[PDB]
């Protein structure tokens, strides 16, 4: 085998710059964000819970 | 601001001619009370000589407003000079700091001197003779 095709896909991948987003809460405040979301405003669709619903 | 001192754990020690106790300092609305001022305050309360009062080891409790330490009073200023440690006398202005070079300079002197027998004058005199 040759070494010619090294690093092909990473080279020709179009570059996307990460969008600037407001910082999430850290630590205890993030710990609050995880509690209120899955145990106060339940998102179940009559018993149907998917954690990261893809757009569908 | 209302600096009140409490002395507990008092033991009289005539063996060294001093009385020792644990000092509780109540200084609300105050950062902390210096060692010198508590000497005037404690000496006036006990009507003793200020220069015969030694206070050290102060640590402030959490949140401030209260300090604890250890107190020493001697039957005379002469007694304080005789038995108190030298550095404490420097702190209180009762004595001067003895002047000496750093530990490195003293140590290298002693080793250099050990290479010489007899008086230092004789060795250099022979050394002066040798090179001349």
């Amino acid at each position: 085998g040759s070494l010619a095709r090294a690093g092909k896909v990473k080279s020709q991948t179009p570059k996307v710059e990460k969008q600037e987003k407001p910082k999430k809460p850290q630590g205890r405040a993030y710990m609050r964000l995880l509690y209120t979301r899955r145990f106060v405003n339940v998102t179940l669709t009559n018993g149907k819970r998917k954690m990261n619903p893809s757009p569908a | 601001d209302a600096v009140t001192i409490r002395t507990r754990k008092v033991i009289s020690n005539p063996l060294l001619a001093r009385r020792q106790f644990v000092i509780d300092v109540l200084h609300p609305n105050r950062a902390n009370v210096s060692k010198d001022e508590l000497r005037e305050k404690l000496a006036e309360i006990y009507k003793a000589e200020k220069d015969a009062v030694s206070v050290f080891g102060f640590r402030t409790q959490f949140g401030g407003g209260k300090s604890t330490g250890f107190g020493l009073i001697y039957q005379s200023v002469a007694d304080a000079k005789r038995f108190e440690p030298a550095y404490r006398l420097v702190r209180y202005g009762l004595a001067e700091k003895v002047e000496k070079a750093s530990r490195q300079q003293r140590k290298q002197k002693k080793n250099r001197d050990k290479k010489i027998f007899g008086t230092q004058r004789r060795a250099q005199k022979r050394a002066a003779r040798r090179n001349a």
Binding site: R28, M31, R32, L34, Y35 | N29, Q61, F62
Partner: protein, 178 residues
């Protein structure tokens, strides 16, 4: 050289890292006590593990065993003092029935919120860590400070705190004088 200074660990992680029953239950426990991270649940679980373990060995011994009798009351007395164990359950059998919710009930953050000094459980920690709660005449900024019964009635703001008759804080002086 100098004698070594003893120290020991206070928490332990579970052997199984991902268990949805345990993952959500801890959040149910941590979320409404406002605990910053799961390690504080670990610390309570670790301490409760050896309190149960200590009582287990005594319970295996005979009744009227001097070691069971001496250590039985001392361990129970230490729990009745902190309010975790009810005064009527001095049997060394209700000790095993203890649950991590009781220990989290005696935390300073828990008690400060439950005494009305804070709006929420989350308001209790920020109020505590900012040096405002004083137990008796001593200021405490440790949220995990367990409360003894004789100190439960003495939980209040610091006398020098801006919320309880102290001086105006940093933001107040910068704004009220400009």
């Amino acid at each position: 050289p100098r004698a070594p200074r003893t120290y020991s660990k206070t928490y332990s992680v579970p052997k199984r890292p991902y268990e949805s029953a345990r993952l959500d239950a801890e959040l149910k426990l941590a979320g409404e006590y406002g605990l910053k991270n799961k390690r504080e649940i670990y610390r309570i679980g670790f301490q409760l593990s050896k309190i149960r373990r200590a009582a287990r060995d005594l319970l295996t011994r005979d009744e009227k065993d001097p070691k069971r009798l001496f250590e039985g009351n001392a361990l129970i007395r230490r729990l009745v003092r902190i309010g975790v164990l009810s005064e009527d359950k001095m049997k060394l059998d209700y000790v095993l029935a203890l649950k991590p919710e009781d220990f989290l009930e005696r935390r300073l953050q828990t008690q400060v919120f439950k005494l009305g000094l804070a709006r929420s459980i989350h308001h209790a920690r920020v109020l505590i860590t900012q040096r405002h709660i004083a137990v008796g005449k001593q200021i405490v900024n440790i949220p995990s400070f367990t409360v003894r019964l004789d100190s439960q009635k003495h939980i209040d703001f610091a006398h020098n705190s801006p919320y309880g008759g102290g001086r105006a804080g940093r933001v107040k002086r910068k704004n009220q004088g400009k």
